[PDB]
Amino acid sequence: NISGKFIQIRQIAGLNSSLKSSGTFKLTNDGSLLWQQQSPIKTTMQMSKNKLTQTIMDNPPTVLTRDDQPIVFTFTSVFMSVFKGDTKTISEFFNINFDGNTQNWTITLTPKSSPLNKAIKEIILKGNRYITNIDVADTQDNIIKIELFDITTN
Template identity: 45%
Template sequence: MKLLSEPLVSSGTFILSKKKGLNWQQNEPFKSSLRVTSTRLEQSMMDNPPTVITKKDQPVIFAFSDIFLSVFQGDKKQVAQYFNLYFSGDVKKWQIALTPKTTPFNKAIKHIELSGGQYITSIEIDETQENNMIINLSNISQRNE
């Protein structure tokens, strides 16, 4: 983030499920939890009670979370409605760049770059406010539900 003199490095568990949505448990440098489904976002920091946001209450926030879930689920049709997609590489090593073409995405994001092989291993989000977020995913495994 632009306000930080050094990058904030965190670690935790990231689980994506078609049925249950996204569950992101951060353990370091502090505990936080984020659960996102198609209709509900629940976030808690440390041991505080969760903040719950519903799609009905905050449709703009859910526009972002819907796209985020669509990217991870490989829903090209959904993503292409809001982003221009650029692909390079092959199935073993690839990169996809997304540039927003509509609001509210182009107001917050300059571009998103994903890279990986069998799975997404890196996500870089370049925001319009000069913040840059890099998410590196490791120890990736697939579970059957």
């Protein structure tokens, strides 16, 4: 399994500040992701058996869908795919550009087609041994910037 920490910074066009959050993630032996936001408000996302669910604070969980939550759904799928090296699946949905080397690389993903290209402008991944940064730009001038750190494989 792979676990780590994240800081997320959301830059929304038209807001005069960025929205910051942070937490942990765990990729388990069985193809599951547990994403736990711990600050400033607790939320949890889980991908298990290709089902994506989210819990906000103590509220009941809901299912997130490709159709209604395309950016989150795609982020989560790409995240899992890159950690397991599954560029085959990524390539079904994205053009892939790779620049760099094992110590410093950047992967640029642009969507091949609709409907994904109605929601996502590009996803940029940067890293070394692991992903260190993920930027998700939508088609409406908003950008989510995620930093991953304290990643350990055990």
